[PDB]
Amino acid sequence: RKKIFKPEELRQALMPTLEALYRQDPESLPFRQPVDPQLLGIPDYFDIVKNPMDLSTIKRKLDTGQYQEPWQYVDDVWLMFNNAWLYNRKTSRVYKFCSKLAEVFEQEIDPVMQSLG
Numbered sequence: 024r025k026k027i028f029k030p031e032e033l034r035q036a037l038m039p040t041l042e043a044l045y046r047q048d049p050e051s052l053p054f055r056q057p058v059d060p061q062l063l064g065i066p067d068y069f070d071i072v073k074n075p076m077d078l079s080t081i082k083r084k085l086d087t088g089q090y091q092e093p094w095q096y097v098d099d100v101w102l103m104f105n106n107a108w109l110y111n112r113k114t115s116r117v118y119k120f121c122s123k124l125a126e127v128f129e130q131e132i133d134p135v136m137q138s139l140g
């Protein structure tokens with residue numbers, strides 16, 4: 024309905040959109056796990072990205088019912104996108120990978136949101 028959404032209702036409706044992102048290979052690969060700046064040799068990552076976000080964290084929040092409203096899920100997805108757009112330059116591979124994920128999410132999310140009311 025509105026405001027009051029059940030955790031299982033949200034998960035069953037929103038999880039396919041997240042799975043659509045996972046299916047993108049290799050585009051989802053940089054976003055499957057939280058960023059490890061020291062592992063990746065980018066020590067200034069947390070200085071630029073104030074609020075890290077990735078697919079595993081979003082999936083965890085859906086499975087544990089940490090989203091009360093479907094729009095909170097969408098916000099985390101765009102936070103993950105913006106982190107990659109902000110930290111990386113437009114010519115970089117991780118930037119282009121992110122833009123492919125955004126395209127997939129933009130084409131899948133509209134019907135799902137309308138079915139949730």
Ligand SMILES: C[C@@H]1CC(=O)Nc2cc3cc(c2N1)/C=C/CCCN1CCCc2ccc(cc21)OC[C@@H]1CN(CCO1)C3=O
Pocket residue numbers: 049052053054058063064065106107110111116117
């Ligand atoms: C989201 C997180 C934080 C961020 O915002 N930017 C990044 C930045 C960087 C790495 C990651 C990175 N990702 C992560 C790499 C691990 C494997 C990711 N895949 C898997 C599939 C093939 C693949 C191909 C190219 C690729 C990455 C990549 O990148 C090209 C490199 C990576 N270089 C150095 C020069 O360019 C980074 O400095």
